[PDB]
Amino acid sequence: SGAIYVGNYRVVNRHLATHNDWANLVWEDSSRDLLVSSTTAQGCDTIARCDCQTGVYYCSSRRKHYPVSFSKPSLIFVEASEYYPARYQSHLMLAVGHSEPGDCGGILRCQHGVVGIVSTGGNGLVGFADVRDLLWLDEE
Ligand SMILES: COc1cccc2c1CC[C@H]2N1C[C@@H](C(N)=O)CCC1=O
Ligand SMILES: [Zn+2]
């Protein structure tokens, strides 16, 4: 589990969104595994606006933050899970690292701020849903 709290937005994995998230929906995209809902309180996270390929992510199944090198956001084939059939997921970045299903929502960050959240895993790889192209998270 986990979310990004930027401005009056809460960014979560679409597959982990709550009824309150759907009832206060701003934007959602199944192909990216992302959903954004509105919040009453202002958040403290800042979004990175960069093309970094190195950063650090939080792994709840180890209680640890790991430094990783990750690929550029791309269209990647992801195997069937309890949340999605086998499909192409867009704006996904891969790194070598430990992940388990409940690690989804952990933040990946670089020197500029939050880059994305854990979205997929298995086989010693971890995939992150990028949020750096969502410029509207910084306003309104
Ligand atoms: C961090 O999220 C995960 C980590 C480990 C396992 C899994 C997740 C998300 C779902 C689940 N999953 C991953 C799929 C894949 N990407 O290879 C294959 C089958 C499967 O059940
Ligand atoms: Zn950066």
UniProtKB/Swiss-Prot annotation:
Name of the protein described by the UniProt record: Protease 2A
Chain residues that bind Zn(2+) 1: C50, C52, C110, H112
Domain of life: Viruses
Catalytic activity: Selective cleavage of Tyr-|-Gly bond in the picornavirus polyprotein
Subunit structure: Homodimer.
Active site: H15, D33, C104
Residues of the full protein shown: 869 to 1008 of 2193
Biological role stated in the UniProt entry: Cysteine protease that cleaves viral polyprotein and specific host proteins. It is responsible for the autocatalytic cleavage between the P1 and P2 regions, which is the first cleavage occurring in the polyprotein. Also cleaves the host translation initiation factor EIF4G1, in order to shut down the capped cellular mRNA translation. Inhibits the host nucleus-cytoplasm protein and RNA trafficking by cleaving host members of the nuclear pores. Counteracts stress granule formation probably by antagonizing its assembly or promoting its dissassembly.
